[PDB]
Design a protein around this ligand. Sequence first.
Ligand SMILES: *CC(=O)[C@@H](N)CCCCN
Ligand SMILES: [Ca+2]
Ligand SMILES: [Ca+2]
Ligand code: NA
Ligand code: NA
Ligand code: NA
Ligand code: NI
Length: 452
Amino acid sequence: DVYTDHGDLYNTPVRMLVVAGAKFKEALKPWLTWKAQKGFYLDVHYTDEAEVGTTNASIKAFIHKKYNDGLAASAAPVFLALVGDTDVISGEKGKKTKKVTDLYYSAVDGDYFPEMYTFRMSASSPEELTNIIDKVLMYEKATMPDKSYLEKVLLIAGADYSWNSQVGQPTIKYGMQYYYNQEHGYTDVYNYLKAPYTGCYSHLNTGVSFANYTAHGSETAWADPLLTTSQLKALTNKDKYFLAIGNCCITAQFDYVQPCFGEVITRVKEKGAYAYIGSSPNSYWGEDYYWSVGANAVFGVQPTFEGTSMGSYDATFLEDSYNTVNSIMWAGNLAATHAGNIGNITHIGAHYYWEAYHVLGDGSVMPYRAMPKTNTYTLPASLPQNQASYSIQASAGSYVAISKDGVLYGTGVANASGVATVSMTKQITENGNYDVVITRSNYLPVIKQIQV
Ligand SMILES: *CC(=O)[C@@H](N)CCCCN
Ligand SMILES: [Ca+2]
Ligand SMILES: [Ca+2]
Ligand code: NA
Ligand code: NA
Ligand code: NA
Ligand code: NI
């Protein structure tokens, strides 16, 4: 089925292809430095490079060739980061959606399944790009002064006379029954299933790790309960950045005449989101229901975990896979595809969904699930020069990275016994202070330095 054939794309060593507008070279530096420090092998290119070009066709040909060349060397990019708005990386009109899509940058071979996890850091200025980066770095380096906002979520089944009872409430109730609850570490699960919605967006300010809205949308708003781009600019969640998902129409229509809701929620300074998942064209009630809960869900009936396939919520909470922002959207699209394949009621089709949904902001973030755990590690007093690998003790599954000045020298994943073989692609030949970073899904990062 679609789950066996097109599972989670995340793989190690992490490799990322970055295609960016030339005006963003300087602003990108801190984000690229941190991604290298945490173990990403980066291949960074700008549209002022003739090999890349500035057109939809040239950029796409460039990305497809980088993917195929990478694959040929068993070094395929895992992520594709598009940096800029449509004035620098246009996207193209969806064959099914008739609206802008980034799908065809990521879809290299003949089907509609992406080869890479693609996200767009959409900004109209270097300042707006830095706003996104600063939120991402605080979240991923876990430098926020109050981590307790991570134990809280906001879930809204918005207004619709026919579908709030049929799909909105069953979706949110499924999320709360199995995952967004005290058993999973969540202390505050703000949820609005029906009117009155009074005060539902105050929680965005007081602090949430995650905000999910399912109902009507517009290019610049969650329609009812209303949250406009003007209200997003007035948010006050300093040091409390979240992932937001709009399972609604057109909030991620990023070629719109005005910055769309997804663009504003990620671009706003020291408030809003570090990432947004939403749809460029209309989304449909049927497919959105499967997207969140899984296929085999029935309208107007609260779905069970055993009675449905894997949806976006289910994937999010698997401990060992689907641990990135992009993988949450990937799992949702898989469930909407599976529902069509097995003959559930569908309203639009799988191809349309793969063209529709987008990540705005940083899709490579690994979101925490309530309070992240403290990792266990042992770092040596020093690192001897000219070694093919180092053995570093860390909890099983931890990703260890050694770097200096934003240049990644080596990576390794801790084995079952808690030992990582850090394979050095660049051997340490000069004395100095080298960065050691240890990450693991739903664990606080370990950020240290070792002398050589
Ligand atoms: C966007 C909207 O008004 C509806 N046409 C679709 C909403 C689907 C919500 N999950
Ligand atoms: Ca493909
Ligand atoms: Ca735009
Ligand atoms: Na509680
Ligand atoms: Na499910
Ligand atoms: Na997961
Ligand atoms: Ni707590």
